[PDB]
Write a protein that binds this ligand. Structure first.
Ligand SMILES: C=CC[C@@H]1/C=C/C(=O)NC/C=C/C(C)=C/[C@@H](O)C[C@@H](F)Cc2nc(co2)C(=O)N2CCC[C@@H]2C(=O)O[C@@H]1C(C)C
Lengths: 7, 206
RNA sequence: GAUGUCGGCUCAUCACAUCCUGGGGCUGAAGUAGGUCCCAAGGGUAUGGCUGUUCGCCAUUUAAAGUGGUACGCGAGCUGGGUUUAGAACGUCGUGAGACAGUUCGGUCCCUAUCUGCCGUGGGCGCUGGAGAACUGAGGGGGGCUGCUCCUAGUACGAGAGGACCGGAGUGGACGCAUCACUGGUGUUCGGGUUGUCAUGCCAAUGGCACUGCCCGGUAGCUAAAUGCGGAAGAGAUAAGUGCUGAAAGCAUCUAAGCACGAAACUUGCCCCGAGAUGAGUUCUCCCUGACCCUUUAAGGGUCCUGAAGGAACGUUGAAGACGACGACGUUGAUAGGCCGGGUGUGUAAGCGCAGCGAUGCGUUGAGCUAACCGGUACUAAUGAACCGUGAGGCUUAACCUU
RNA sequence: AAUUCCUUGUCGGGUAAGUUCCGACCUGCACGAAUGGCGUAAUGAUGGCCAGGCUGUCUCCACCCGAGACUCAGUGAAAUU
RNA sequence: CACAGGUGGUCAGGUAGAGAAUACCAAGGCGCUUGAGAGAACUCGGGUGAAGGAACUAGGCAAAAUGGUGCCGUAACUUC
RNA sequence: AGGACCGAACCGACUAAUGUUGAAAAAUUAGCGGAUGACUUGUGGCUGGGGGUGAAAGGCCAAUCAAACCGGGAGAUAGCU
């Protein structure tokens, strides 16, 4: 959700 | 023509009269002896079989005992072969000295390299190390990519055993030949560590 | 009911529409230096400044700083500046919530590798008696770059200025292998200085702890920035291209038959692996020359005796090593450790004595200590043994024995 | 310009070379005066830039001391299929 | 969970030090419920480094060192 | 004297690395910031779900917040898998 998995 | 078998005794410095220091790799070329003389009627190539050194009586095998006793030559520490250039002739029991290299002026030495064991790509293939800081995550001295978007091509430079293999240095200048001491002063460095056996043959590259 | 996106880093790989080097044709090619086109992919093919950038501009180099494919190669390899969340501002639009391919500051990138594949390294079996070595080399990799300077020659050319191919020599850069004698780094296993502190009863003298307490040096070994070598020459067949002879086609023509030149490509030669090359190779040497039974009577099975050549295991070990493996030795013995001597390094120990008010200094003394190194030494330990594998090696054919 | 599309505006300074930075000009795509304007000493784990010093960040990595990785005995795990 | 976790109060030795910092100790309490051997790549945590010294990179992350006491001395600007 | 200075406890959490089936469902190590104050802390108590509280982030309200948890309406409805 935050950008690339899982930022 | 043919070469010989000796021992790497080490390295020292030779000072000339003009004040120059010539690196040398001293070699203890003990008196060699021929063991077999092979021709085309039986084997199919003109070569010889030479040994050197000595060995313990109660340690050498019986098969080789007859192989050496056949030629009436005391046992050695091994066996090697040299091909003849269509103009060489020898006989079993013949002893060969270091004077054979009296008028050659150059040789190509051969021997086994030192043992580095399991080595990395940097130690082995001179790979470029990645960034040590500025984000690097457990990938400092690693190779990196090894392919594309689906098999690693054969011969891919990787980590593995480094050393302990046949190595041949070429066109080494000769400096001195002292038959009294059975020595040979070869310029430069050669493979193998002190005590290891190595081959010395005239230079084909001039 | 998930194929993770620019660029950088790293590691690369193929194509040739060739950037350089190589070989040629025409040239409005004098020469030097260029232009154009052909053959050629063997190897090689910048560093930095600004920018997140690729790109691009700029500076300075280079023989040249190639064009492209590989999920605009490569995030179960790294990065996370950019893109691409939630936060907050400017500009702008909207009454407003909010929004913009407008900008700006900030902002968790997970995975112990089952298979394939790749780099390395072993076991087992096989190759037809078995065992121990040395080879053949079918095949497969590695390597293949290049500048400058001098002579040839201030020659040919040219009015001068300017300034050669051909051929030879030397010296360099980058890359690559090996090596540690030299120059050096490392050296928490050597020595010494020294702060604070605890302890060894105390002084003296030592040791521990504090990043090896902080430092100065430094053996072996490893190692590069250090020093030696290397790219080839040569040969054969060729590409573009140039040809001789020569008809078809009375002449002409490099070709159709024939024949001679021809490049860093290809095949060779240099280096390494290499008989699991199941097409399983070749040479030398060594060891085994039993008594019977029974049986679907056979490449049959079992018992008693026999147990070699050699190997393995075990052990002491290695400039060999992840483990296996490989190498050396095992009392007929220097394999390791210790011990003796020596060398190297550290730098005048301790103790006593002398001087001085004392801290300290001097003499004994270049003293004592000293790791892995050199040369020697059986003092200890590597044990007699047993464990291991056998007994003449099939059938057929041809030639020999008994040419 | 935390605002400027054209744009790395133009000039100058600094650098061997500066799309960034500072100082000026104004052609203000689309600043603007309490949703405040222009300044402002000091302050800031604030943003941007240039220096000195310092260094293995790098050129180009090398060696060493430790904990794992590796082997042996013991226990024995987890994810996908 | 036999957990690198959190926390309210009280007692507060000696040497050095300004100090409840820090370093070595006392009292007293522990060595952290698997170990042995080897001494490869690579990773983690550290130490040293030839010559150059930010050329690294989006951007100088860490390290080291400046680091303490006393004395001299101390710019622009300023709300003094 | 000081919402003053350096700096432990204490309270915080700017950077980096490790870890990321972790020792740990947000930590460790190295440094870092405030440290007489708008400070911090113990015990107890009160404000309560379209409401509370909020030096304001759509933050917190028992590891859950653009409307908590539990139960019930309830076998909500699902023209979609
Ligand atoms: C605020 C968050 C940005 C947001 C992300 C949405 C999102 O749901 N991302 C999850 C990623 C899913 C992936 C990687 C799935 C793969 O199985 C297939 C893809 F690979 C195919 C593919 N993706 C893209 C292009 O092609 C692609 O555009 N994206 C993949 C990475 C994120 C980016 C994207 O969607 O960004 C959006 C922007 C635009 C608003």
């Amino acid at each position: 959700x935050t950008x690339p998995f899982x930022x | 023509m043919i070469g010989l078998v000796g021992k790497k005794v080490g390295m020292t410095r030779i000072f000339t009269e003009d004040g120059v220091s010539i690196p040398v790799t001293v070699i203890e070329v003990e008196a060699n002896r021929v063991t077999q003389v092979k021709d085309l009627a039986n084997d199919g190539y003109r070569a010889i079989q030479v040994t050197t050194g000595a060995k313990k009586a109660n340690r050498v095998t019986k098969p080789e005992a007859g192989h050496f006793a056949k030629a009436g030559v005391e046992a050695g520490r091994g066996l090697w072969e040299f091909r003849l250039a269509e103009g060489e002739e020898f006989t079993v029991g013949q002893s060969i000295s270091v004077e054979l290299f009296a008028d050659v002026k150059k040789v190509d030495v051969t021997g086994t390299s030192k043992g580095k064991g399991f080595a990395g790509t940097v130690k082995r293939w001179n790979f470029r190390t990645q960034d040590a800081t500025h984000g690097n995550s457990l990938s400092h001295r690693v190779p990196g990519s090894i392919g594309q978007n689906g098999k690693v091509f054969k011969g891919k430079k990787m980590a593995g055993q480094m050393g302990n293999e046949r190595v041949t240095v070429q066109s080494l200048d000769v400096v001195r030949v002292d038959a009294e001491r059975n020595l040979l002063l070869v310029k430069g460095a050669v493979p193998g560590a002190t005590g290891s056996d190595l081959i010395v043959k005239p230079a084909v590259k001039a």
